[PDB]
């Protein structure tokens, strides 16, 4: 069977992900690489009206005390549903086409602007740190993360906070929120550590007690306090006896299952756009390909990505 | 490897679903059958405060014009997330234990509801009540977990008048008696049964889609008819692809489910007997590990103890 390479470019907004990706895509022949872009049209028009603006306005009014935490949370939870829909359907339609992990060049490379976990985990977790989502709703999103397909390569981004702030403070409906920037940077850092922790054999249930008061593909096993598991020692989630309610513990089991089979890479964005492109190109050499399940899978997948791009891209 | 029988008791609430199942659970051995009950404690306390109350109060305020459709929709959407969480975690932890199709089962696992109740049926009913956008409904649909082998779902049959009578006598905490919601949820579940049949007899929604504007049910009698919603269509009338893919997901998830209808228009002991009768045609699966069976038992009783009333 012909092989496929799937690459999800993810991480905090404002690092140059979209630019780097387009530059990579520009290197290939028309139909040996396809881009699944940010579905900004879904977010702005098709799924609901100006969702990004809604999110940033709701946080602002919370921060100004014009609305309650409860009001903010129902809006953020609803908006996140809308935000995540295109990632979820794409994953669901792709799934039956993906075979086992498989090296000769892939017949097709599919690059995505973000993985479903961005909207079903990372942004919710950050909004929780911002006080605008409950940890129960974050764990409800986690419970809904789809099974992790073979050959899930995720590229996360590294960038010094100062450079990141500057790059953001220049270049939707977004507002310049440094607290949110810190939160989402923390969350993606925890994410990278979580994958490495799991792949190094870490068992969150075994280490849960070590809680009280980044890189993957490399390094020693992180402490559980430097992983996503640390976010869920919240009093809302704990029984009177001090333990996690089982319903929430099962959600963390799901979190561990979903993240542990992912292949995570870190891209250094602190360079020129062409620099990021070539760094990303070199990085793909260590990435995991898969077989597809049918002969016609490749052109089908190609049609799906282009259809997506046309309808939901800017 | 030992065999498992999973049975999801579902359908509109207020038919006597809960009474029927608890009687049945009390006929078989303490540990050849386990009941995963309604996660009412999650809904009222663990996940959020009085989610049911929240849901019915929001719809009431909408009906009275005290809040906008947009306001109601964000609340209904968030609430449905809370409502379905125990079903979704349960499915996700159970999923690796389920093997292929498979003589009595080593274990019978009876659930109060399937994840589609909260990820499809109640959202679609609220759409019909003007309190959820069809885009949010399709987002929930996109997240319906893959349908595992042996997914046996029991739906209810009950005349509307009798249903109103039963419902009135067993309101849940915070619930309001809403005949419009009763009709919406009854219609959604009727369309669901038809949809499974339509799909199983080889119906293709894309091929029949034109019929909504111009041997199996007519597509106008399935859930697909709900998604002719104008919010989902381009200026030229075409369904946006992103919504069409969500319908492809809906089709895939539903066609492999095994539906059984339970007539609730009888006595509780009768309902119990009828449910036991329905089991002979249900599909069993193997489990995947020697340890799967006791792990499942442990999950089920823990769920019950922590989240059941
Ligand atoms: C994916 C995602 C985003 C991403 C961006 C674009 O990078 C807009 O903030 N923002 C948000 O608030 N929630 C989300 O799920
Ligand atoms: C499952 C479910 C219900 C059902 C019950 C009673 O079975 C509680 O209202 N009600 C609701 O409003 N949303 C839901 O997802």
User: Which residues in chain B have Cβ-Cβ distances shorter than 8 Å to A246?
Assistant: 302-303, 306
Kindly report the protein residue whose alpha carbon is nearest to atom 8 of ligand 2: B52
The boundaries of the domain holding residue A120 are 1-314
Q: How far apart are CA B124 and CA A15, in angstroms?
A: 39
State the first-to-last Cα distance of chain A, in angstroms, to the nearest integer: 34
- Broken C–N links (> 2.5 Å) in chain A, after residues: 102, 171, 213
Q: How far apart are CA B125 and CA A258, in angstroms?
A: 31
Question: Which tokens is A127 given?
Answer: 């909004």
Scan for tokens 């559980």, then name that residue: A224
Q: How far apart are CA A231 and CA A215, in angstroms?
A: 19
CATH number of the domain where residue A116 is located: 3.40.50.300
Q: How many residues does chain B have?
A: 309
Experimental approach was: X-ray
User: Which residues in chain B have Cβ-Cβ distances shorter than 8 Å to A311?
Assistant: 240-242
Q: Does B173 contact chain A (CB < 8 Å)?
A: no
Residues with Cβ < 8 Å from A266, sequence gap 6 or more?
A155, A156, A157, A158, A192, A214, A215, A216, A217
Scan for tokens 């690092």, then name that residue: A15
Q: How far apart are CA A179 and CA A168, in angstroms?
A: 13
Q: Do A89 and B246 touch (CB under 8 A)?
A: yes
Task: Indicate the angle between helix axes B292-307 and B69-94, nearest 10 degrees.
Answer: 150
Query: How many angstroms is it from B59 CA to the middle of ligand 2?
Result: 14
Which of B114, B126, B12, B41 lies closest to B75 in space, CA to CA?
A: B126
> E strands, B174-300, where?
258-263, 285-287
Q: Does B53 contact chain A (CB < 8 Å)?
A: no
> E strands, chain A, where?
3-9, 33-36, 98-101, 108-113, 153-158, 263-268, 290-292
Scan for tokens 């890189």, then name that residue: A215
From the CB of residue A240, how many other CB atoms can be counted at a distance below 10 Å? 5
- How much of chain A is in helix, strand and coil states, percent to nearest 5? 55, 10, 30
Q: Which residues is B239 bridged to in the sheet?
A: B233
| Total number of domains constituting chain A | 1
Resolution in A: 2.1
Please state the φ and ψ torsions of residue A28, each to the nearest 5 degrees: -90, 160
Helix (H) or strand (E) holding A251: helix A246-260
Chain B interface, mutation test: which of A38, A81, A145, most B Cβ atoms within 10 Å?
A: A81
* Closest atom of ligand 1 relative to the A83 alpha carbon: 15
* Closest atom of ligand 2 relative to the B117 alpha carbon: 1
Which of A187, A186, A189, A228 lies closest to A207 in space, CA to CA?
A: A228
CA atoms in the 13 A half-sphere facing the CB of A101: 11
CA atoms in the 13 A half-sphere facing the CB of A266: 17
Question: Which tokens is A20 given?
Answer: 């780097």
- What DSSP string describes A13-57? TTSSHHHHHHHHHHHS-TTTEEEE---HHIIIIISSS-HHHHHHH
Query: How many angstroms is it from B83 CA to the middle of ligand 2?
Result: 7
Task: Indicate the angle between helix axes A135-143 and B69-94, nearest 10 degrees.
Answer: 60
């Amino acid at each position: 069977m012909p092989t496929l390479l799937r690459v999800y470019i993810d991480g905090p907004h404002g690092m140059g992900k979209t630019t780097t990706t387009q530059l990579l895509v520009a290197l290939g022949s028309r139909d040996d690489i396809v881009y699944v872009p940010e579905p900004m049209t879904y977010w702005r028009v098709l799924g609901a009206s100006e969702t990004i603006a809604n999110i940033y306005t709701t946080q602002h009014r919370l921060d100004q005390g014009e609305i309650s935490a409860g009001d903010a949370a129902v809006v953020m939870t609803s908006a996140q549903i809308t935000m995540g829909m295109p990632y979820a359907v794409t994953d669901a339609v792709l799934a039956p086409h993906i075979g086992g992990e498989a090296a000769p060049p892939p017949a097709l490379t599919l690059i995505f602007d973000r993985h479903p976990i961005a909207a079903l985990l990372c942004y919710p977790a950050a909004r929780y740190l911002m006080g605008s989502m409950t940890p129960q709703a974050v764990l409800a999103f986690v419970a809904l993360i789809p099974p992790t397909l073979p050959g899930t390569n995720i590229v996360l981004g590294a960038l010094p906070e100062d450079r990141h702030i500057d790059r953001l403070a220049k270049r939707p409906g977004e507002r310049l929120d440094l607290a949110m920037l810190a939160a989402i940077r923390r969350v993606y850092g925890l994410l990278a550590n979580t994958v490495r922790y799991l792949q190094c054999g870490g068992s969150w249930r075994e280490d849960w007690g070590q809680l009280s008061g980044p890189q993957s593909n490399a390094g020693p096993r992180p402490h559980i306090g430097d992983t996503l598991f640390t976010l869920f020692r919240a009093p809302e989630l704990l029984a009177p006896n001090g333990d996690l309610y089982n319903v929430f513990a099962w959600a963390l089991d799901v979190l561990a299952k979903r993240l542990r089979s992912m292949h995570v890479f870190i891209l250094d964005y602190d360079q020129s756009p062409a620099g990021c492109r070539d760094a990303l190109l070199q990085l793909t050499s260590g990435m995991v390909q898969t077989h597809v399940t049918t002969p016609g899978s490749i052109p089908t997948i190609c049609d799906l990505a282009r259809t997506f791009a046309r309808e939901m891209g800017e």
